Amino acid sequence: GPEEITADIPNVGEAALSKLDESGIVYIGAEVTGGDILVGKVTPKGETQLTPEEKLLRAIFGEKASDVKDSSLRVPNGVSGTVIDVQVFTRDGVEKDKRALEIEEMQLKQAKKDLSEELQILEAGLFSRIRAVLVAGGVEAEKLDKLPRDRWLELGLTDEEKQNQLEQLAEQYDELKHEFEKKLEAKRRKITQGDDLAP
Amino acid sequence: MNKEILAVVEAVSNEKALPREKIFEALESALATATKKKYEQEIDVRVQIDRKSGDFDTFRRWLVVDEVTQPTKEITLEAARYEDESLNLGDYVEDQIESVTFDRITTQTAKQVIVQKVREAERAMVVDQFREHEGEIITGVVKKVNRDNISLDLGNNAEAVILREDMLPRENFRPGDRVRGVLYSVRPEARGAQLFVTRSKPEMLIELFRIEVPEIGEEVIEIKAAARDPGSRAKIAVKTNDKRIDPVGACVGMRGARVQAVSTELGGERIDIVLWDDNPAQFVINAMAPADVASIVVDEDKHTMDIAVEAGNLAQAIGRNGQNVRLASQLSGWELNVMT
Amino acid sequence: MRLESVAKFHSPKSPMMSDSPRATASDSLSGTDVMAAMGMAQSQAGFGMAAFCGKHELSQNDKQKAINYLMQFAHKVSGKYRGVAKLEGNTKAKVLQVLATFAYADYCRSAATPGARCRDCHGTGRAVDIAKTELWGRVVEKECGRCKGVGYSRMPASAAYRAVTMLIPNLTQPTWSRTVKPLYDALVVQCHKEESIADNILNAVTR
RNA sequence: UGGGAGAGGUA
DNA sequence: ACCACAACGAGTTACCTCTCCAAGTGTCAAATTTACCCAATTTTATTCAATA
DNA sequence: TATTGAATAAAATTGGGTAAATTTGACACTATAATGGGTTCGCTCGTTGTGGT
Ligand SMILES: [Zn+2]
């Protein structure tokens, strides 16, 4: 039977279950010691017998491997210290966990903040370039900065080479937004795809 | 929706000497204890698992008392006013709705309590197989001796116990042979071993004569009193309302056959057959045989005899280290005195 | 009840053949604390532990310990058997030695004794009745008629008789059955009693 | 569980 | 009778860390086990009288 | 007044056999033409047997 990582661990005391979360993984920051539990992984032991006691157990609950051997990862003895990082990899097809969803959301928010700062500085450089070609074409200094920088596209003049450059850098900013959301989608599917783990 | 209670009623049903309602009581006590230990508040929740549905509704209980402790079960007379005084002071009915979850800790404590419930239900099975027949010679094989007891069996996963004091002094039962014993009066409430079987009781000899002799079986010859020195010597008392068949000759049989049968089944114990009489004086001058009678003083108040006995028969009159006087006194009820 | 798990634990390390091992907990017990509990339960109930290890051929040195404890019990209990209670010192010590050794070999005799397994059932004591399978359809079992259910040839008590009448020549078979053989059966019943009380004290320790 | 290689290190 | 080749064996001790190491399925003859019978043979408690 | 040796009957064992199940091992799956393989060195020094003008 396939193993599972859940906080439901048999025949252990609830003191050691305080360090784990509700999803079976230890909290970031918990000062563990030797002989403690870090992640609760249980193993199906095997049916191998048909007694009325286990028959009534599998009748009343449905835990069809109600004999399970707790084989959780424990910290080796003489070792101590806090917990500073927990990384959870998963294979394809299996729904991961609440904890893996939380780690995934945190990594997603961090990558999205980095890509947002990247887009902010890139549109800053592109709007500096459209300001440079605008002051190369004509003399407009106060009327460009008296209006906000993000709306630097609706201002126009007579149709000429600088107007053609204004509209071509407008559509270049549009395809910059396009490749920006494509980078977002690539990052999202890269951190949402299941890992190429061992067989 | 529960196919699981349907499995209880046909698929995972018990041995058929156990009722279904006790299994339902076992599982309802199991889920009650499982929801009892799981709640952090000291709630003695007793859940009514109704029989036909399988699913249920969790029922935290309340008994009508006026105490200060246990507020989760402490309802008062003014709380019985909500059901307007139609109940009793102290019954633990409920007026609440709760839910239920599952967990492997609940699973293991449920396993503990259901093996306890099927254990006591099998104990009640041995209780009714005891109370179906009160007092008889039985036969089982000894299977596990102990320091103070000898465990037995009667088949169908039953067990019996010979204690230390109610066996023969020449007992030697290697585990594996069949022994004879009489269950007499066992404790049906005993949490450990129940079926108390003896081998050195007067009930043993009278039940052995009952299975041995058909006129004991159909009440032609009757045995009234008994006397025992286990393994060595014995005496039983015989009266008979019938006048046809010779009583003592009947219970000795063809060349001491029935006496040798009970003697080899008892371990060489010299059962000495002697008549029972109703009157005390002539009963005891019949009873001390093979001793001789000179003169008898019958005493009423302290329940004793006084026996004059001539010289020569003192050793066979007293037995060995006062054996015959002791055995005859616990035969007749009258303890004996020495007179020349 | 409790004792046979320790006989499982007296073996060397056997190779495992399964998937993910090493529960790494105190679920049942370890393999060293069981021996520590055997040590704690040796000051009382050492007779039954020595007899159990000698019977199951694990630590084959406490066979002599069990024979010595049985010899001490026979020396304490010999004052109630008319055949042995009249003999002199070293001769009574030697007859107690020889019937203690034969009583302990009779207690030790199970279906793993070399030359003692049943011929037909191969020790199981349970053969299949072909007629009941032919009339019922399902598979049935019955009692092995040669071994009569026990699965092994029992030890005859006359082996000790032959081994004692090389020392007490004037002791025939009727008086052997009359006032010697109850001591032999008392010895084997004492072996079973001591093993039971040692299992009880083991379960009282490791609880 | 526990075996074998290879690499580096300590006295 | 008196010299140049292959191959073996040897190279301290102990400890530490790391990485890396298809599918039953049907069929057929011969050998083998297996459940049982049984005569002999041993075992073991019981009997008869003869001393104790 | 017991206790014990000769005799003894019933039950357990044992060696041998034996007719009948049953297991063991081996097979069995089919056509253009096709026709001789990829390893190993600077990796020192003593001994000993085997083969050689
Ligand atoms: Zn057999």
Cis peptide before B290 (omega within 30 of 0): yes
Residues 68-107 of A with CB under 8 A from B: 68
Q: What is the 8-class DSSP label of residue C191?
A: H
* CA distance linking residue B7 with residue B28, whole number of Å: 16
Measured CA to C1', the nucleotide nearest B256 is: E47
Instruction: Please answer whether residues B109 and B115 qualify as being in contact, where contact means their C-beta atoms are separated by less than 8 angstroms.
Output: no
Residue B112 in tokens: 């503990």
Please judge whether A56 and B114 are an interchain contact, meaning their C-beta atoms are less than 8 angstroms apart. Answer: yes
Round to a whole number and report the distance in Å from the CA of B289 to the C1' of F7: 34
State the DSSP string of B7-43: IIIIIS---TTS-HHHHHHHHHHHHHHHHHHHSSS--
How many Å does it take to go from CA C151 to C1' F15?
Answer: 18
Exposed, middle or buried by CB within 10 Å (0-12, 13-18, 19+), for B234?
buried
- Closest Cα in chain A, distance from residue B224 (Å): 50
Which nucleotide C1' is nearest C16 CA? D1
User: How many Cβ atoms from other residues are within 10 Å of residue A58's Cβ?
Assistant: 18
Q: Is the CB of C174 under 7 A from strand F?
A: yes
Using a CB-CB distance cutoff of 8 angstroms, which residues of chain A are in contact with residue C22? 71
Report the C-alpha gap between A196 and C123 in whole angstroms.
Answer: 54
Which residues in chain C have Cβ-Cβ distances shorter than 8 Å to B174?
Answer: 185, 188-189, 192
B168 CA – E23 C1', rounded, Å: 69
What the block records as the tokens of A24 is 């079976």
Whole-angstrom Cα distance, residue A166 to residue A145?
Answer: 16
Q: Angle at which helices B20-38 and B104-131 pack, to 10 degrees?
A: 150
Chains with 3 or more CB pairs closer than 8 angstroms to C?
Answer: A, B
Residues within 8 A of A (CB atoms), C 10-69 only: 19-25, 27
| Chain A: closest CA distance from residue C23 (Å) | 4
Q: Which backbone phi and psi does A185 adopt, to 5 degrees?
A: -70, -35
Q: Which two tokens stand for residue B192?
A: 């450990």
- Give, as ranges, the nucleotides of chain F with any atom within 7 Å of a protein CB: 1, 3-8, 12-15, 21-22
From the CA atom positions of chain B, what is the Rg in Å?
31
CB B234 within 8 A of CB B269: yes
* Phi, psi of B60, rounded to the nearest 5 degrees: -75, 135
User: Among candidates A51, C148, A136, A182, which has minimal Cα distance to B141?
Assistant: C148
Spacing of C-alpha C148 from chain mean position: 20
Residue with tokens 């010679």: B137
Shortest CA distance to A183 belongs to which of A117, A89, A137, A131? A117
Residue found by looking up tokens 């081998």 in the block: B199
Asked if residue C47 lies in contact with residue C198, where contact means CB atoms within 8 angstroms, the answer is: yes
Write the residues followed by a gap in chain C (C–N more than 2.5 A): none
Rounded CA-CA distance B182/B133 in Å is: 11
- Three-state secondary-structure class, residue B196: strand
Pairing verdict, β A4-5 and A41-44: antiparallel
CB contact under 8 A, A71 and C27: no
A190 CB-near residues (< 8 Å, 6+ apart)? none
CA-to-CA distance for C89 and C76, rounded, in angstroms?
Answer: 14
Per-window interface: B 57-116 vs C, CB < 8 A: none
Nearest to B180 by CA among B158, B198, B157: B198
Task: Please state, in angstroms and rounded to a whole number, the distance separating the CA atoms of residues B107 and A61.
Answer: 8
Contacts with B27 (C-beta within 8 Å, 6 or more apart), sequence order: A56, A60, B8, B49, B114
* Angstrom distance (rounded) from CA C74 to CA C94: 11
Rounded distance between C-alpha atoms, residue C96 and residue A163, angstroms: 125
Cβ of A70 within 8 Å of Cβ of C25? The answer is yes
What size, in residues, is chain C?
A: 207
Instruction: For residues B57 and B73, give the distance between their C-alpha atoms in angstroms, rounded to a whole number.
Output: 18
Integer Cα distance of A84 and C126 in angstroms: 63
Nearest CB neighbour to B172, from listed C189, C196, C200 = C189
Decide if A45 contacts A65 (C-beta within 8 A).
yes
Which residues of C are less than 8 Å from A11 in CB distance?
27
Tell me the nt nearest to C157, Cα to C1'. Answer: E43
- CA-to-C1' span, C129 to E5 (A): 76
- What residues have CB less than 8 Å from C136, skipping those under 6 apart? none
Which token pair is B134?
A: 């009160």
Residue B145 has its nearest CB partner, among C150, C182, C193, at C193
Token pair 């279906």 in the structure block, residue: C111
Q: Which residue shows structure tokens 């003191």?
A: A15
- Structure token digits, residue B251: 């219970």
- With beta carbons less than 8 A apart as the criterion, state whether B266 and B303 touch: no
CB contact under 8 A, A60 and B110: yes
Contact B176/C at CB under 8 A: yes
CB-based burial label for B307 (10 Å; 0-12, 13-18, 19+): buried
DSSP for B218-271, please give it.
TTSSEEEEEEEETTTEEEEEEE-S-SSS-HHHHHHTTTTHHHHHHHHHHTS-EE
Give the nucleotide with minimal C1' distance to the Cα of C131. E35
CB contact set of A193 (below 8 Å; sequence gap of 6+): A92
CB B197 within 8 A of CB B129: no
Å from C139 (CA) to F20 (C1')? 18
Taking the Cβ of residue A11 and every Cβ of chain C, the question of whether any pair is shorter than 8 Å is answered with yes
How far apart are the C-alpha atoms of B193 and B151, rounded to whole Å? 9
Alpha-carbon gap, residue B329 to A191, rounded angstroms: 99
C130 in contact with nucleic chain E (CB within 7 A): yes
| B290 CB neighbour count, 10 Å cutoff | 10
With an 8 Å Cβ cutoff, is B170 touching chain C? Answer: yes
Q: Is the dihedral of CA A87, A91, A97, A103 positive or negative?
A: positive
Considering only residues 33 to 72 of chain A, which have any Cβ-Cβ distance to chain B shorter than 8 Å? Answer: 52-57, 59-63, 66, 68
Q: Count H helices and E strands in chain C, helices first.
A: 9, 2
Token pair, residue A70, equals 């707790």
Residue A50, amino acid: L
Contacts B–C by Cβ distance under 8 A: 25
Protein-covered nucleotides on strand E (Cβ within 7 A): 34-38, 42-48
A-chain residues near C24 (CB < 8 A): 71-72, 74
- Strand-pair partners of B237: B225, B274
Q: Which residues pair with B64 in a beta bridge?
A: B75
Alpha-carbon distance C26 to nearest alpha carbon in chain A (angstroms): 9
Task: Using alpha carbons, select from B180, B24, B188 the residue that is nearest to residue B117.
Answer: B24
Q: Is there a contact between A55 and B12 (Cβ–Cβ < 8 Å)?
A: yes
Maximal CA-CA distance, chain C: 68
- Pick from C185, C188, C196: CB nearest B146: C196
Which of C9, C36, C63 has the alpha carbon at shortest distance from C206? C36
Q: Is B37 on the interface with C (CB under 8 A)?
A: no
- Does B249 touch chain C if contact means CB atoms closer than 8 Å? no
Nucleotide E28 C1' to residue C137 CA (A): 26
The Cα B229–Cα B263 span in angstroms is 12
Query: Residue for token digits 């070399």?
Result: C114
Strand E and C156 CB separated by under 7 Å: yes
Q: What is the C-alpha to C-alpha distance for residues B161 and B146, in angstroms, rounded to an integer?
A: 10
If residue B234 lies in a helix (H) or strand (E), which one and from where to where?
strand B233-239
Question: Which element (helix H / strand E) includes B233?
Answer: strand B233-239
**What stretch of H or E contains C49?**
helix C47-55
Q: Which nucleotide comes closest to C22 if you measure CA to C1'?
A: D1
Tokens of B258: 């029935």
Give the 3-state secondary structure percentages of chain A, helix then strand then coil, rounded to 5: 45, 10, 45
Task: Tell me which residue has tokens 């009727």.
Answer: C174
Structure tokens at B178: 């069949």
State which residue of chain C sits closest to A3, comparing Cα positions.
Answer: C20
Pairing of strands B149-151, B270-275: unpaired
For tokens 């000429």, name the residue: A160
Phi-psi region of A93 (alpha: psi -120 to 50; beta: other; left: phi over 0): left
Closest CA of chain A from C203, distance in Å: 20
- Whether C148 CB is under 7 Å from strand E: no
**Which chains contact B through at least 3 pairs of Cβ atoms less than 8 Å apart?**
A, C
CA distance C112 to C97: 24
- Closest chain C C-alpha to B96 CA, distance in angstroms: 38
Domains of chain A: 1-94+195-199 (2.40.50.150), 95-194 (6.10.140.1670)
- Nearest by CB to C24, which of A3, A11, A71? A71
